[PDB]
Design a protein around this nucleic acid. Structure first.
Lengths: 1322, 48, 49, 541
DNA sequence: AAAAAAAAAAAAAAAAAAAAAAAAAAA
DNA sequence: TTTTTTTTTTTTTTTTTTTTTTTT
């Protein structure tokens, strides 16, 4: 069974791979994140609860006073989204927190309080999230792209041998917490362990250990294994452990128990070590020279003199051994230093280390971090404690704790947010092990090393910043203040928190203007993943490592959708099925494979867990059971692909499309295309302006309904029902009785948007797509938005492309467009611009918008009203007066400062707004618009009341039928008196009064709503300081196609329309239909985007079936043959899913299907399941078009046949918004600059072009001197020369007087401003 | 630019506007293209 | 074109002729740049004939 | 003061530079210092004020060098005199070495093949805006304007008389077209404008090669030489017809590029048996006349009487007439080649190297003007006959080889055998890896060879006999062999397997991708074939 | 009401040139 | 014990074209 709106036009689907997981809600990231940012959490871990519990309670400076947090609430916003956009204020909710202040007593470290007081204090307003995942800041729709920054934890990076002549690798570990100073541990060419706190100057690593109360003996014990040497009265015996003998050569006879195990010279072999192990030898004899260089472990003091014979970390020598022999020491502990297994890195680092005790290390670290000023016993200690072991100033986070524990192979997964001694020591041990040979570095691109912050995380962090600011403020106030019984309202300032949150939500690298010129662009912008912004890598700081597609992108991030150019790869776009793990990592779905059965249960795998398991391919055949038909199947286990067995497989892809984003899953026949051109197509598909009549994708990808529905534009019925009233401005839906709540009698009123400007100046417009009295179910499309058609995304128009080189007019990439494309007016686009005029209050006097303007005629003021503001609907061309505004003028006495239409734009003034400051007069047009809004609101309120009151009156009539029956005595009198009749003594006696009181309550609700709307409309709006009022006008230009208007398909083939040929001149096949476009085919082979030719063939087939339907419907034949043909058309292909048997379809529904298909049957071609090249032939042959796909075109002008039959088919073409009249502009005598006399900025400011540093070499290379001389002397710079040549040219004389550039004088003056004297000697 | 200008100032250096760049900055003719002859004339009139 | 002139109550060193890496003052007096910046910070005296 | 302006923005708001903030700080500190000296303040306070004045003057002279740069109320490092001098935004590199220029404009471009080599289109509106002082001068000369204000108003209203004046001015007044990345001196060339309705700067196609300008929306600027000397410069040095030879190498830069070349290649060819093969014609005129009526196909082997000229004498041309054996297509082509060149130049397949060398021969034997007119004629005829060809590209023009699957089966068997040998320990990991890459490369080369054999010669027809082979007319082979936007490398990713792909490290993955673009790539193979694309894009960027 | 500058900011790669400090290696 | 060379280390440059509660 199919949905009704789907039943209007069911899209043929070629996908042979069944769907197991429907494409989830495409905006899960933003909505889920901001929902976690605001929520009443019983156990606050995420949301405002987390920040409040982190900062609160607040304690005075031992002032016996404390402020503690209770709860928080979000008051209903004063304004809502529509009026928030129109009026220009942020759509924010005010956060209001209950805070409890308590005062203690004397001699009560923890005793009971003496006084308490709770108060609900308003502190800041947070911009709420619209239903589509977009914030509303200042009348616009900003969005916060999600960030992708290096995950907190421990990263064991290497140098890969670079940055040194020897080509040595210098392994280095880095601890990156979510908030606080970093901590690195890096080696050097000399194999000494060095540290650099906060990427500051370098130091020996051991210093930190000394600062952690660790002696040299403790360091050696921690990082080294003891080797015990004994004195058996001579010969310096030693306790042997066999495994320590590996990698060494026997310098002497290694023997014990009177058995020669190894001899001098021979290297120790694994067989020798095994023989020693079997022999069970613990103690051996070795020469004294073995200790000639070894390092003592712990200090030794003479028993007689109490003097230090030798301290720890000192190489032993023969003299030292002789001295300590008679001292009375028989046991000596050295360090097992080996060149391959246990390197002496700590020993050499300690030798380099100049510090000796904890205090010296702390002084050194203080001088490091805070140089210049003297260190102190307390200052260094406090600094180091507040650096890495302070909850206030250093917090791993927890994603940080989990990564830290997992990387170091620790059992637990949660703990403290601050590092500990064990943590640092374990980090050093692991880095030393990686240096030794055991362990492997962690690449910083494995997507299990990069979180995804969303709007929620960043908003929470900024709110916490504001919270700590207000915490400092209240801390200053409290100890300063006394109890004062001062309510907890004067202590808290709402400016810091509001300022911080608004600053983030309004100004940042991430909170950017939405690219709102499509449904697709909105949905792909909201699901973006940027690697820039605060806390992340900047553009110029990124190499090629992060820019590349690591093998863990599959299923998480899209490989073929990144904006080409300076920032490529840093702006990765999310995949289709990707999600956000609880820690923020990118987890993607997979299917659980049991012993042999592919169970339908879905497991989400993070970037980490994917490596361990074995993952199959999406296109692996199964036989009705989950059993693989092939005993061998492709898999990708550890970042590498390979053929694996049947049972060894663990997981399989949920659906073939999950490798791509949503911006590139809309390209048909993607699997045939190149990667570069797929990127071009998926990057040029989110710029198609919404055409005047968006029509259809004739070859889609089956994934177009989700894009339209899930993005906010398309609108959708909240509750099923039957349409009661359809008008191009509003729709009324009568909810079904089963879907309605018992209390209210609900009818849903959808107020559509009619020609309002979008952020890219394209015109978003919602029209109804449901006729009067037509049923609609839950979640079905009612009002098609911009660039949508019956709920299906329609980015452009599908036209009859014909590949052939025509007379050179498509030489490089240009597209030849038949004039039928513009005559039918299918690429026409409505561009709505906004112009503003602000009347301020100057010191000389306030400005006015009076219609009377000095010195201007009467035709200019004709288009103005009595108030001087242009009419609604007046056709204003360049230069017209739009708002007559005048200002005071010094020694008429006023100056005309009327806003005028910028030259070049020419449109109809569709709407005018007038915002007035609270307590300022209103002009005539302001009164008119106020009255319009007021009457609209009153009419809507009355219409809403009507049916609700009528139902109550009908119920009253029905009640009156029984118990006081009045068949004809009741209808005569007015309904107003129907509520004042008596009743008999029964349960129904208290029913007339109840209904009357309910009616009174309804009228009260109506009147209060009317009053509230009237107040909200009439109130003078708030503006900037010093601005009296603002008058905004909306022009509506209608741009048609012309040479220059860039056009591009979906496979990344672009082009500039090069000529609009007459209808006749274009090629035409024998049937007379002329092809509406003539591409250049030479760009197909080299660019290897061969997807477009298959799309063209499938489009020709689709329209062939459509034209057959149209012919069969032109003559009223029957429904039966229509049924048979449509069934033969939908049953085509093999294995295709979605059995669409029309027996269930009603006859009238079949007729409606035929009506909606006659323009061409839509065809769905999933991204990587695809329509086979053999099925396209079958569908072409279902009509009567040639199977090969190429028909014979007759040249339009000559009239003689083209040789070598040529391709033609219905390709889907967009209209990119790089319109020619936005670009073309030229200047001759525009106004110049002020600092350096030169032309101004381009286009809007009327400036020229940049004869830049690279365009002066282009002339010097020639013998060009005079042209260059003028190009940098009199065209731009010399103040008097340009005027002189102006007069000369007007005088007919072609010459110059070059003089000297004014900018040279500017440079001379600026150099003279310094202490350097510069002049021009002659 | 700081280094070059500081060195020129301390050294008291003296530029004579002979190359393809200083002439370009000052706006005078170029000593390479059509202006070549002019520059030669400017040299011939000088010291004559 | 017209310029002014501010009369400092005290002489001030020119940073360009002080902090350019081949510091002109630094090697004019053969005095290390650190010992010069220390002097400019009023951190220590210096004998003057 | 003017160099650090304090203009009031519209609405009583003032826009000011950072020199003012630093100067205010310096004067305030100097005032405090003088006041402290007057008051005889203790040593510490006067020392602190002196140091603070030192820092303030340091910031004013060169901010951000000593200490940390002091910001304003906007929390950014303010710009001082030094930042105004140096930097890519400094006066030297932004306002001295190159400045914005009057009498200039920009727009998007198109093809416009009807243009001759030395004239580029110019939109009417943009041209009117550019040449406005010229229009005023001509009008006040002709007397139609009493004063300059009247002329300005007449032009603004765009009267019908202004068009004749503009067409009079445009006649001989070159305009310099200039693309954005002008890497070399052939990125600024002076054409003669031709007024065009619309808003597109029509540009002659061939010059694209010099500009590297492709009509995918790449914008271009037009400047207007003003003075008499500059006009003569743009006429005698920078004209497009004068730069028919690159500055880096002695080869031309007017090579017919990608569509004209396909037209000539399709038009200078031979079919073993086409309509009207083997008759005798009375010259190129007869050949063209036969072709237009359709009696003889475009390329059919025939005998034609041609007169070819040589300048072997002391600058005197001598003709010789002979009955050459050619095709009707070459007979039609010969009417465009100038007198001097020999017929043998236009008696071959005429790909991209042959046509470019034909242009070079014309240039070196005749001079400059003959070769310019020859290039124009070649472009016109190539476009026209590419149009007449109707050279298309379908999904039946990528004939996957019949023995591809056999080669892939052999390769799979070999890799299985090598894996088994590894299981036996006979081969180490590296050696087996090298062997596997070797066998995959050999199989890929075999597949490509089979493809080319089945694509280039496969066409077979008959001429009074059984059959005979010929160079195929499959459209992709025509667009690859001719050198016109194709190559043997960009093909073999359509029909034959597309070889191996490299990982981010630069290594070569053991298993290649064995599916071409005509058969579509499954998920894993396509995902593998994105490392290369992103590496290439980043490398270019 | 006219004016006015403190902060705790912290942060980035990559590569290379140049100056200053430190460590050999002597006699 | 002093002095010169060489090495190391820190620092300085470059990194495309266009399009807000508080003193006078």
């Amino acid at each position: 069974v199919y949905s009704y709106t789907e039943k209007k036009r069911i899209r043929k689907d070629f996908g042979k791979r069944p769907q197991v997981l429907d494409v989830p809600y495409l905006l899960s990231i933003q909505l889920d994140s901001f929902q976690k940012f605001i929520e009443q959490d019983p156990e606050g871990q995420y949301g405002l609860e987390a920040a409040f519990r982190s900062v609160f309670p607040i304690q005075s400076y031992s002032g016996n006073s404390e402020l503690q947090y209770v709860s928080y609430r979000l008051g209903e916003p004063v304004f809502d989204v529509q009026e928030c956009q129109i009026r220009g204020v942020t759509y924010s909710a005010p956060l209001r927190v209950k805070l409890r202040l308590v005062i203690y007593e004397r001699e009560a470290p923890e005793g009971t309080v003496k006084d308490i007081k709770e108060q609900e204090v308003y502190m800041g307003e947070i911009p709420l999230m619209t239903d589509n995942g977009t914030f509303v800041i200042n009348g616009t729709e900003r969005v916060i792209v999600s960030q992708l920054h290096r995950s907190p934890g421990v990263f064991f990076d290497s140098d890969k041998g670079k940055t040194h002549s020897s080509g040595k690798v210098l392994y280095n570990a880095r601890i990156i917490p979510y908030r606080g100073s970093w901590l690195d541990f890096e080696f050097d060419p000399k194999d000494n362990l060095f540290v650099r706190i906060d990427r500051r100057r370098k130091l020996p690593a051991t210093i930190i250990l000394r600062a952690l109360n660790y002696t040299t003996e403790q360091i050696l014990d921690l990082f080294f294994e003891k080797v015990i040497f004994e004195i058996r009265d001579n010969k310096l015996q030693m306790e042997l452990v066999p495994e320590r003998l590996r990698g060494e050569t026997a310098s002497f006879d290694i023997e014990a128990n009177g058995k020669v195990y190894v001899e001098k010279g021979r290297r120790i072999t694994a067989r020798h070590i095994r023989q020693l192990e079997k022999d069970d030898v613990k103690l051996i004899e070795v020469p004294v020279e073995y200790i000639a260089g070894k390092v003592v472990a712990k200090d030794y003091i003479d028993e007689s003199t109490g003097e230090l014979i030798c301290a720890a970390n000192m190489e032993l020598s023969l003299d030292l051994l002789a001295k300590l022999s008679q001292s009375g020491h028989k046991r000596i502990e050295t360090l097992f230093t080996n060149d391959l297994d246990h390197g002496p890195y700590i020993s050499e680092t300690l030798r380099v280390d100049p510090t000796n005790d904890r205090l010296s290390a702390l002084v050194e670290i203080y001088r490091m971090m805070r140089p210049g000023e003297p260190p102190t016993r307390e200052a260094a200690e406090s600094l180091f404690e507040n650096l890495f072991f302070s909850e206030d100033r250093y917090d791993l986070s927890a994603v940080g704790r989990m990564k830290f524990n997992r990387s170091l192979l620790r059992e637990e997964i949660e703990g403290s947010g601050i590092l500990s001694k064990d943590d640092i020591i374990d980090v050093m041990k692991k880095l030393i092990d990686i240096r030794n040979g055991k362990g492997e570095v962690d690449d910083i691109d494995h997507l299990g090393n990069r979180r995804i912050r969303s709007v929620g995380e960043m908003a929470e962090n900024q709110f916490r910043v504001g919270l700590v600011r207000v915490e400092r403020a209240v801390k200053e106030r409290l100890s300063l203040g006394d109890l004062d019984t001062l309510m907890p309202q004067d202590m808290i300032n709402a400016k810091p928190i509001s300022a911080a949150v608004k600053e983030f939500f309004g100004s940042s690298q991430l909170s950017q203007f939405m690219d709102q010129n499509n449904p697709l662009s909105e949905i792909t912008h909201k699901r973006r993943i940027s690697a820039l912004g605060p806390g992340g890598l900047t553009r110029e700081r990124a190499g090629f490592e992060v820019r590349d597609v690591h093998p863990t992108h599959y299923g998480r991030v899209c490989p073929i959708e990144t904006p080409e150019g300076p920032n490529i790869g840093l702006i990765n776009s999310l995949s289709v099925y990707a999600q956000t793990n609880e820690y923020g990592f990118l987890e993607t779905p997979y299917r659980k494979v049991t012993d042999g059965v592919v169970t339908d249960e879905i497991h989400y795998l993070s970037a980490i867990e994917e490596g361990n398991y074995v993952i199959a391919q999406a296109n692996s055949n199964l036989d009705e059971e989950g059993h693989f038909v092939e005993d061998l199947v492709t898999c990708r286990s550890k970042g590498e692909s390979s053929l694996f067995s049947r049972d060894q497989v663990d997981y399989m892809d949920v659906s073939t499309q999950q490798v791509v984003s949503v911006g590139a899953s809309l390209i048909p026949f993607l699997e045939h295309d190149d990667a570069n051109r797929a990127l071009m197509g998926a990057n040029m598909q989110r710029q198609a302006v919404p055409t005047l009549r968006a029509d259809k994708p004739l070859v889609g990808t089956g994934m177009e309904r989700a894009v339209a529905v899930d993005s906010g534009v398309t609108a959708v019925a909240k509750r099923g029902g039957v349409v009661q009233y359809v008008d191009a401005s509003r729709i009324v839906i009568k909810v079904n009785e089963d879907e309605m709540y018992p209390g209210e009698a609900g009818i849903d009123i959808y107020n559509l948007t009619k020609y309002t400007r979008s952020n890219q100046n394209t015109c978003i417009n919602q029209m109804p797509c449901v006729s009067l009295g037509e049923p609609v179910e839950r979640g079905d499309v009612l009002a098609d938005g911009p660039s949508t058609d019956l709920g299906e995304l329609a980015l452009g128009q599908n036209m009859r492309v014909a590949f052939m080189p025509w007379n050179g007019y498509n030489f490089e990439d240009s597209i030849l467009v038949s004039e039928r494309v513009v005559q039918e007016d299918r690429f026409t686009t409505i561009h709505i611009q906004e112009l503003a005029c602000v009347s301020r209050d100057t010191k000389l006097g306030p400005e006015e918008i009076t219609a009377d303007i000095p010195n201007v005629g009467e035709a200019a003021l004709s288009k103005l009203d009595e108030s001087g503001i242009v009419y609604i609907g007046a056709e204003v061309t360049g230069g017209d007066i739009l708002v007559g505004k005048v200002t005071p003028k010094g020694e008429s006495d006023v100056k005309d400062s009327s806003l005028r239409v910028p030259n070049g734009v020419s449109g109809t003034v569709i709407d005018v707004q007038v915002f007035t400051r609270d307590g300022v007069e209103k002009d005539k047009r302001a009164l008119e618009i106020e009255e319009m809004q007021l009457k609209q609101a009153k009419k809507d309120l009355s219409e809403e009341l009507q049916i609700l009151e009528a139902g109550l009156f009908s119920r009253i009539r029905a009640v009156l039928v029984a118990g006081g029956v009045e068949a004809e005595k009741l209808d005569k009198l007015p309904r107003d008196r129907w509520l004042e009749l008596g009743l008999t003594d029964e349960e129904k006696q208290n029913q007339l009064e109840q209904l009357a009181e309910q009616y009174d309550e309804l009228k009260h609700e109506f009147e209060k709503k009317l009053e509230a709307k009237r107040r909200k409309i009439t109130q003078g709006d708030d503006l900037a300081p010093g601005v009296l009022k603002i008058v905004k006008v909306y022009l509506a230009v209608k741009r048609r196609i012309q040479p220059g208007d860039k056009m591009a398909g979906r496979h990344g083939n672009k082009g500039v329309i090069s000529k609009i040929n007459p209808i006749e001149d274009m090629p035409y096949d024998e049937n007379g239909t002329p092809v509406d476009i003539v591409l250049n085919p030479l760009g197909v082979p080299s660019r290897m985007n061969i997807g477009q030719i298959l799309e063209t063939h499938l489009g020709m087939a689709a329209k062939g079936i459509g034209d057959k339907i149209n012919a069969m419907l032109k003559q009223q034949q029957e429904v039966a043959k229509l049924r048979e043909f449509i069934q033969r058309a939908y049953d085509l292909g093999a294995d295709v899913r979605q059995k669409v048997d029309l027996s269930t379809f009603s006859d009238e529904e079949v007729m409606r299907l035929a009506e909606n298909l006659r323009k061409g049957m839509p065809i769905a071609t999933p991204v990587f399941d695809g329509a086979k090249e053999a099925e396209i032939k079958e569908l072409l042959k279902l009509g009567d078009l040639p199977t090969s796909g190429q028909i014979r075109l007759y040249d339009g002008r000559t009239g003689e046949q083209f040789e070598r039959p040529v391709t033609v088919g219905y390709m889907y073409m967009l209209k990119l918004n790089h319109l020619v009249d936005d670009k073309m502009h030229a200047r001759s005598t525009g106004s110049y600059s002020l600092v350096t006399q030169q032309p101004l900025g381009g286009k809007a400011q009327f400036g020229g072009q940049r004869f830049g540093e690279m365009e002066v070499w282009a002339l010097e290379a020639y013998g060009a001197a005079y042209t260059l001389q003028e190009m940098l002397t009199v065209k731009s710079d010399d103040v008097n020369g340009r005027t002189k040549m102006y007069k000369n040219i007007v005088d007919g004389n072609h010459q110059m007087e070059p003089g000297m550039p004014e900018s040279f004088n500017v440079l001379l003056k600026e150099i003279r401003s310094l202490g350097i004297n510069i002049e021009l000697e002659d | 630019t700081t280094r070059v200008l500081t060195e020129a100032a301390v050294a008291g250096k003296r530029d004579e506007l002979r190359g393809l760049k200083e002439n370009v900055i000052v706006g005078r003719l170029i000593p390479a293209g059509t202006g070549y002859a002019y520059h030669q004339d400017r040299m011939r009139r000088r010291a004559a | 074109e017209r310029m002014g002139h501010i009369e400092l109550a005290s002489p001030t060193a020119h940073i360009w002729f002080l902090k350019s890496l081949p510091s002109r003052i630094g090697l004019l007096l053969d005095m290390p740049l650190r010992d010069i910046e220390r002097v400019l910070y009023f951190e220590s005296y210096v004998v003057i004939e | 003061p003017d160099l650090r302006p304090l203009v009031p923005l519209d609405g009583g708001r003032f826009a000011t530079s950072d020199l003012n903030d630093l100067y205010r700080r310096v004067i305030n500190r100097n005032n405090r210092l003088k006041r402290l000296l007057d008051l005889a303040a203790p040593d510490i306070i006067v020392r602190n004020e002196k140091r603070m004045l030192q820092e303030a003057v340091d910031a004013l002279l060169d901010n951000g060098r000593r200490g940390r740069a002091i910001t304003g109320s906007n929390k950014r490092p303010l710009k001082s005199l030094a930042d105004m001098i140096k930097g890519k935004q400094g006066r030297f590199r932004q306002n001295l070495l190159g400045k914005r220029v009057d009498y200039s404009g920009r727009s998007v471009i198109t093809v416009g093949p009807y243009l001759r080599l030395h004239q580029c289109g110019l939109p009417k509106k943009m041209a009117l805006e550019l040449f406005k002082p010229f229009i005023y001068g001509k009008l006040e000369l002709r007397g139609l304007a009493t004063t300059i204000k009247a002329a300005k108003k007449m032009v603004e209203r765009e009267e019908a008389v202004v068009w004749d004046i503009l067409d009079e001015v445009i006649r001989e007044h070159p305009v310099l077209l200039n693309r954005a990345p002008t890497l070399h001196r052939l990125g600024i060339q002076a054409f003669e404008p031709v007024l065009i309705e619309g808003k597109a700067i029509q540009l002659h196609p061939l010059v694209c090669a010099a500009y590297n300008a492709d009509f995918d929306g790449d914008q271009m600027a037009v400047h207007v030489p003003l003075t008499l000397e500059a006009q003569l410069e743009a006429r005698a040095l920078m004209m497009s017809t004068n730069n028919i030879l690159s500055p880096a190498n002695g080869e031309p830069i007017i090579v017919p590029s990608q569509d004209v070349v396909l037209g000539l290649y399709y038009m200078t060819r031979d079919c073993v048996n086409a309509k009207g093969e083997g008759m005798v014609l009375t010259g190129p005129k007869e050949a063209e006349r036969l072709y237009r009526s359709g009696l003889a196909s475009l390329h059919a082997r025939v005998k034609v009487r041609i007169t070819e000229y040589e300048k072997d004498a002391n600058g005197e041309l001598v003709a010789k007439t002979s009955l050459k054996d050619t095709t009707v297509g070459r007979a039609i082509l010969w009417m465009i080649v100038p007198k001097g060149l020999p017929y043998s130049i236009v008696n071959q397949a005429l790909g991209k190297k042959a046509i470019s060398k034909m242009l070079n021969t014309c240039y070196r034997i005749l001079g400059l003007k003959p070769t310019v007119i020859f290039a124009d004629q070649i472009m016109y005829t190539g476009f026209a006959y590419a149009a007449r060809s109707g050279a298309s590209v379908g999904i039946d023009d990528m004939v996957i080889p019949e023995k591809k699957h056999e080669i892939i089966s052999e390769a799979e068997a070999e890799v299985a055998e090598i894996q088994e040998q590894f299981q036996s320990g006979l081969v180490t990991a590296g050696e087996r890896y090298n062997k596997v890459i070797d066998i995959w490369a050999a199989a890929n080369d075999r597949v490509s060879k089979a493809m080319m054999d089945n694509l280039q010669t496969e066409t077979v027809i008959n001429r009074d006999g059984q059959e005979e082979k010929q160079v195929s007319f499959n459209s992709i082979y025509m667009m690859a062999d001719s050198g016109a936007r194709g190559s043997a490398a960009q093909i073999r990713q359509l029909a034959g397997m597309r070889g191996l792909m490299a990982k981010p490290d630069g290594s070569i993955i053991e298993t290649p991708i064995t599916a071409n673009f005509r058969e579509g790539l499954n998920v894993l193979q396509y995902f593998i074939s994105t490392h290369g694309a992103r590496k290439g894009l980043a490398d270019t960027a």
